[PDB]
Every structure is written in C-alpha cells, then in structure tokens.
Design a protein around this nucleic acid. Sequence first.
DNA 1: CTGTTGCTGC
DNA 2: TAGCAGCAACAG
Length: 1119
Amino acid sequence: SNNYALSAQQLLNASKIDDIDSMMGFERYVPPQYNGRFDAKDIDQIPGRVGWLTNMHATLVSGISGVDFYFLDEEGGSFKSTVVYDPYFFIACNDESRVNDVEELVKKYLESCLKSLQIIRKEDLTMDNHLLGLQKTLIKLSFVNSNQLFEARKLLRPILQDNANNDAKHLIEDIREYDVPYHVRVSIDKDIRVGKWYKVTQQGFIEDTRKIAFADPVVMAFDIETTKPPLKFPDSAVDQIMMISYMIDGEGFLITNREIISEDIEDFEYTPKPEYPGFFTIFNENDEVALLQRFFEHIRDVRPTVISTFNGDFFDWPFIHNRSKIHGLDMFDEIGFAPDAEGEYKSSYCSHMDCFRWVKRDSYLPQGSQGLKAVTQSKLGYNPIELDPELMTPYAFEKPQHLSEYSVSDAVATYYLYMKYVHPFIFSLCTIIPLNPDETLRKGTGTLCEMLLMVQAYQHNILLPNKHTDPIERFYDGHLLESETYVGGHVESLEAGVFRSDLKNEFKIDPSAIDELLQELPEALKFSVEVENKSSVDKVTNFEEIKNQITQKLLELKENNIRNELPLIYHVDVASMYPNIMTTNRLQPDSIKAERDCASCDFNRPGKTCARKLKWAWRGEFFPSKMDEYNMIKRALQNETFPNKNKFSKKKVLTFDELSYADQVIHIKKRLTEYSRKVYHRVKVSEIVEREAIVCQRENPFYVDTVKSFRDRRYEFKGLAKTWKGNLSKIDPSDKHARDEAKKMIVLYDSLQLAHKVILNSFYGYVMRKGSRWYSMEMAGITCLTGATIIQMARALVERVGRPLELDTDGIWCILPKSFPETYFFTLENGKKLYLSYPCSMLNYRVHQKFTNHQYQELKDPLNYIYETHSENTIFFEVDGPYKAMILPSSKEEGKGIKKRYAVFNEDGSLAELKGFELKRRGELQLIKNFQSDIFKVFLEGDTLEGCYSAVASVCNRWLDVLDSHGLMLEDEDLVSLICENRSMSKTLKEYEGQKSTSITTARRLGDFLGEDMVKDKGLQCKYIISSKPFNAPVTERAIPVAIFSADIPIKRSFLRRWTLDPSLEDLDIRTIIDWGYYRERLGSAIQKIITIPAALQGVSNPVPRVEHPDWLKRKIAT
DNA sequence: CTGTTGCTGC
DNA sequence: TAGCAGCAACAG
Ligand code: SF4
C-alpha cells in the first residue's frame, strides 16, 4: 500500500512539474512516427526535431520511470522530450553451473516488484583469466520504476547478510550496479549529454556534430539587499527585502521596495568597463509583496533557462522563499523553484548557477579571495562598489541612490562572472559528463571522475565494482590502526634569502656532473629533436652548431667550476606529473594484482615481462597497544551494558555483541585511548614501511586508455586554441564582421582544454577518493613514490650544476649560473624552428633513461588476444622563466628553512608569484598582510645586496614605529582595521566543545553580547583583538570581538569589564585595551623570517636592529 | 617534544 | 565524498 501511495505522490509531483514546464514554454514534444531505415548520416531526412540538450531530470510518467530532456534547441525558444527506460541491476552467482536454480529462486522471491529478468555476460576485471575473453555470468533484474528496484534491494539485502555471517539462496554472491542514479543510467546507456546536440527520435537520441557551438540560453543573474539589525545578520522572519538587482542577457533591472527605500530611483548606467555594459531600468514597487510579485512575473515573462546568483543557495533564495511564505505566496507554483534534499534551490526548466560553487571548486582562488569583490578584482579586473553592511539599512533612508548603485554593482559582477567563466566551463563539462548543469556545478571533482570512468567501463562492457567501504578497524603488528596512508609528494626548503637576476651568487659546480652532461649531450639533443619535438635529426641543418655551442659553455663551467656571477632564476615543473606517471607505468586499480591473481593468470610463464613490480611507502598511525591488550579491552567491554540508539525499539539496553560492529569499535577505540595513555604514556606511533606491488601490463585497457585519450584530446584543443589564435589575428580588423562567433569558440576550446585538464588532474586524485569506486590506495602510493624519486633525481643534478632553492612535489625552483647553456633553436630544412631549453631537455633525457616503461603491453589483435610490448614514457619537465628575483624566508629555528612560501618577480618588475604567505590566506592578522604587501616589491631596490636589505629595513622601521607609538599616528577606524584578526570557524560553536582557540572565544563572546543568532550557522567570521594594558592573562582567553567597539557605551562597558576582569574600568579606548607587546612580537616574527634572518644567512649584518636575532644566531656569529 | 586546527600547496 | 606534506599558533 505504501509503495502505490509513494508512486501516486511522485506522479502528482510530475504533473505539477509538467504544468510549470509548459508555463515556461517546455511543452512535451512527441516526434512523428517514422517506419524508414534508421541511418544517422541522413539525419536531415530523419524525423522529429533536432535540439541541444540544456537540462535533464528524472521523472515518473503515466508510474513508469523516464527522463525529461529540455532543449534550448536550435532555432526554438525550447521544448522538452521524454525517454522511458527500465531501471535495472545485477545478481552475481558463486557457481556459474547453477545460475538457472538462482533464476527460478529470484523470479519467485521478487514476483511482487520484478518487471523482467535476463541472463547477461560482462567483463569482470577481478575474474581469473578475463583477459582471454572469459565473462562473468549475471542475472539482470529490470523494474517498471526506481521504487520497485529499491524494494527488490530491501528483499535481497537480508539474504546477503545471512550468507556472509552464517540451497539456491547460498548461490547469491552479491548484487552489482544497484546504486547508479537513474538519470545517470539513462544518460550513459543512451549516450545523451547536456552541452551536446541531439536529434530526438522514436528510437532514442542521436548525437549531432555539425554544431559544436552552444546555443545562447536566456541568462538571468540576480542579487538581493535586505534590512538588518545593527551588528547582527538579516533574519527572514523579521527583516524585509529592500531591493532586488538583476541582469537579463546584458540589460539591467532593479526592483525597489518603497516601504524601505525613501525616494523613487531613476534609470541609470553602471558600466565599470566598456566590456561590461549595465543599463538599469527601475521598478519602484509600493511594498515587499509587490516587489516579490514583480520579480516572479518578470521571471515568467523572460523564461530564463539559467538563473545565476552569488551564494544564493544559502542566502538569497532562502530569504525570498521565507518572505514569500510570510506573504502567502508559493514560490514553487509561481516560478518552479524549490529547496532540494540538500537545501539547495532548483527548478525543472531552469538551472541554478550559484557562481560561489564554481568559486569554491574550480576558480583556483584561495579561500581569502572567494568573496564577490575579491573574485571581481581577480577575474573581471575592476573594483566593484563596496558598502559597509551596517550602512545598508540606514542608506535605504539617507542615501538610497548610493545603495541602488551598490546593489546593481553586485548584479553586474555576478552576471559577467557567470558569462565569462562559469557558463563556458560548466556546459563544456556537461558535453562529456552524464550529469545536468546543477549537478556538474555542485558535485565534488572525484564524483566527476567516477561518472567518466562509469561511461568508459560501460562502453567496454565492463561490470562496475561496488563502492569501497573502509574497514571499521584494522591492525598492524597487533596494534589498532587509528589511520593508514602512504608517503605523499616530496617537499624541501633548501635555501632562504633574496635571489635577483641583477645580484651576484656564488656557484660551486661539480666537474663530474659536467663530465656526465658532456657524455649525455649527443643523445640528449637527439632526444629533444625525436621525442620532445617529434621530428627527425636528418631534417635539422644546425644540429652540430647547437651541440658545439653547448659543449663550449659546459667546458668553460668545468674548468672554472667555482664562479661568482649573476643567476638565472628558473622553475622546472613536470607537465601533469601524476597523470603522466600513471600513463607511463600503466597504473590503474584494474591491474594492481596479488601474487594469487598473477599465479592464476594463463599469461604467467617462465620469461614473463608483463608483471611490472613497483615500490610504494605505506604509513601507519597505530595505537601502541598489542593484539592481546586489544582482546583484553574487548573482553572487558563484553561485561558492560550500552544504551540503545534506536528510538523505535522498546529495548533500552544492549550487550556489547548486540551493538553494531562500528559501535563496538568506537567503544574499543575509546578504552584503548585511555589504556594506551596509562601504560605507554603516548598515543599514535607512526611507522613507514616500503612495500612492493605487481602492476599487470596485460590487464584490459580502459582506465589508462581513458587517460591517454583524454590527454591527447586536451593536447588537441591546446593545438586548436593556437590555430584559432592565429585566426584571430591573421584576418581584418572589422571586429563586427561575423567573426565574434570565432572568438566565442576560442573561449570554448580553451574551456574544453581546461575541462579535460581538471578531469585528468582529478583522475589523479579520485583514486584515493574514500568511499568512491575504482578506489586504489596502493596505486596512489606508487604514483607518489615514483614522483618523489623523479624530483629527487632532478634536484640531485640541479644541486651539482647550480643551487635549488625550493622543491614542491613536481616543481623545482633553482638558480643557475648566467653563463649556463639556456635556450636554442634547431632549424629544419623547411625553415621552421624547433625550440630547445637545455636545462629542461637534460632532465627529460635522464627521466627517459631511468623511468621509461619497457614492459608496456597493448592489445594489437582482440580476436586472438595478441599483445605487443613497447617502451612508454610521457614524463616531461616544462620550464618557466627566467626571472628578475626570488625571495625566500627563513625559519626562527637553527638550520631549518620554510617550505611553501616565496615571492618571485618578472623582468618587468611585476609580481609573478606569491605563495603561502599570510597576505594570501583567508583571515590572518591584517597588520601582517599589510606589512607583506608593502615589503616584497622593495626587494627590487638598491644596487647591492646590502642596499637592498637597507631599502626594506626602512619599510620595516615604518611599521615598527606604528606599534612602538601604540598606534597614535593612526585614525581610530584605521586602527581597528589594522589590528584585527579574522578567522573562519568551519563548524558551529557547539561542535567545538572542550577545545580552545581565539575563534571559539570570540564566537562565544559574540553570542553573549549580540545574541545566540550570531552563532547558529557554520562559517562564522570571528573578528577579534587581543587584550591587555599594563598586566597580562591567557591568550585564547583574551580575544575580544571588535564588534564590541561599535556597541552603545553602557553595553561596551559591561562587556569589556567582564572580559578583562576589571570591575572598575572607565577607559574604553581600544588603545588601552590592546596588548601592544603581543602585536610587536607577531610583527617581529615576520621581520625575522622575511628580512633579518635571511640577511644573516647571506652574510649581511642585521639590517633591522630594533628586531634582535635569536640567541642561536647571535651565537652562530663568533670567531 | 607532540597534537590539534585553518587555509594553503603546487 | 579525490590525495599527502607543511607553517605556525597555542596547549599540554
Ligand atoms: S603478470 Fe601476466 S600472468 Fe600475472 S596476472 Fe598479470 S597478465 Fe596475468
């Protein structure tokens, strides 16, 4: 009864969606009957209608499961069409001789929900000898809809649990493919993809290629301005919407609520650049309900198939929907928008493109630059208008024109952020990923890898693995593992200092490294022609000229091996390092074989070449307790009694063995933490064990073929990109002469390039995606250890011919002598020039001689299972630079460097890279950010090293004066701003219980002072100052929310008194509250790491005497 | 000395 | 629902 009721409820929701879709122009098109011969070559005679699939969703049709497909379509404004398809999954059998006994059992056991059954065959890469065409026999179960499929899973799961813990029932091994989403199933099984064009026909969807450009959907982008209380956040229960700003296809609009906005706003232009027009037409509406009705009316009129917002999943749409509910409007019946199971806002016809999702995932912006202004500055390259949130509600009455200018600025910023970056990126991803735009924007990158691998496995008739479930506990040497992993990317900080293209450095070249390079030179130059440039040496007219020029420079560096000359500042980095290690070594999770599976394989003979053995470094963190002590703790817990977690059970108490195995292990881990601390005084030993695994080269190539093929398609688009770049400049300059179609397609191929790029680097990660399928914790360890070995080999050469400064995973930063052999050009007989970078090609040659896979096997004849063996290697360094300067900081500790922080400057004086520093990080003490933001460029001043340290000393002394002067030389608003430290709490304050930190204390005090609403959401920005005047107290106990300094005087007083424990305090000036010694020590630290200690290591005497060296360093300097 | 956590690395 | 290595503040 409940399943019919649920199917009727789903049909009633599907009818409401059909009514809404028809209101928005998405009438359900059914194609004409065509009894002719189906050939996709004669598509124009083929019947029905061609369209580009813009939006797809799972539906229930008169219920039968189907997918509705929404076609921005060519020509048309839009039309939907439906594909019906039976939901299915598989049963696996342990004995293939008795499949018919299992078939009869499941027909009779699933009769209440099963539509049909069929025996099929699939390749299973875990089956012994599948590489001979042996396929696993499977029972396909098909259903009328997804609800009946879910009931069959509820009936089968008890049999699998009985079989695993304790007759044709015991022949059921597992259920396979039971957890594929239904729209993803239809998209894979029919090869239909959003962003791709299709002709909708009776037989299904036929992809079209004569059309690579996207259609132009109607794109709306909006933002909302709300009332708020002072120092608090707008509450949709009490606060009103003041204005809604939006853009539609490049026209601007503003709706204003005249209960709140004091004047009628006139039509105006906000064009922040000539490439971002914004003409705003104004709707001055009488009240908040007229504002909401106008907004819903205008959405129905223009029929947007995309609505974009900035963070509107979590502010804008929640606010509009709650205000609509207060006024008795149903936003779902008005415009088709509702919150989903995640609380994100979605419709059928229109995709919701929250730009903040792309900003968080894909923009590559650090979390400190992920707010709208900093995204606009970093992507659109202008400053939007900026208003203080505390001035918004006053300015609705005092200056509403300046509030409307701010609101239209955030609509313009959101619209052009969407159209220049999010739109081309997401629809390009949809052309390859079996997901709609909303899922393609919002799912994690490792889920996008899962979908691509599921397409490729399906196309090769491979059986999908079930999702990996982490074991609840594991043991190593009788110790309970807290966690296991591998040794990841290798990282070194070798030197610290300022390095400049115009300042001299000492070099001590190893003459034996130059002898190796002179002996390798002929084959390294041949390798650069044949492998890097894919040409033949016979075509190169000047090969011996370039060889002799490099030979002379090398001989001069061998004879004069101790030099003091200018540097060349270079970065050498491995192109797509982990993907290229994976393709080179044929690394997948489809091959890592045990000695058993390798022994069971008919290709395992004397002389076998196909078993490539590779090393990895496993890392345990396990409890110091042994298996006897674990068993003693388990026996102790078996005598205890536990509360029943299931509120629906009348049984309030359970024994240990009546708990779930996950709950048993949670209780074991708790008592083991106490026992380990009591007996061993310490908690998590860590150990690194080098392990070996067997990489099959003969195993079915579907994973690696996806990677090779994807890599080549990306290279393809980089090439096409370059050809298009030539096309965009070769031609005439009449910009409007039907060549703006050519430039959008340039953005498009760039976007498909960036798309394959993210997909590849993701495959590289996905493979450690806990809970994902095709997981391969090993494979990941081999990839990292192979990479660590490559980069240490490269460093060990660069250290012998120059000085490596920093090493991070795939990249080495180094200085070479300015006399070093650098860039050259080979001349072909056809007058074309090939590029040579000798510092790059000398590394690439050594990578190819040491890391090539001479065991790579590929299947030449699929009928006879004949494999060819060849030599594969795709691991190349690229070179970036040279540079004008590089500045590396040093640690406060003796003999230690700082990794992952540096600044680099281009020849033109501009900043090329800034890594890691507080300036870039979200949050952080603002004084430190403003400091770093002053100092780095000042390293380009002076003519000597000492003059350069002097110029930066002076900036240090300016900043030290501000703190020694206790800020007096500073405006009071500017002071609060500078001394503020801002830190995000990733959760809510409740979830931090028994922890301490400045954020926690700031949040608690904000709560007490401004109310519990302040801390109910996650992501709270805790802005605080550290207190103290002539005394002292605990750090995390001394964070004061800077907001208190804007409270009414009696409030401020009561709280600062509490927080400082001073009943009788009268002085409420921030300046007497602040702990100046704390801030001088934080700034001192920065000055040490970036300026004084590195100065010392370059033998320059303390350029900032007001900051004293630590003792070890003072001591260092005695002779 | 370790261990926790935020935001970066690359 | 991608991974590991690292800086550094603050507690113990
Ligand atoms: S190494 Fe050869 S014999 Fe062993 S599992 Fe792989 S393909 Fe089969």
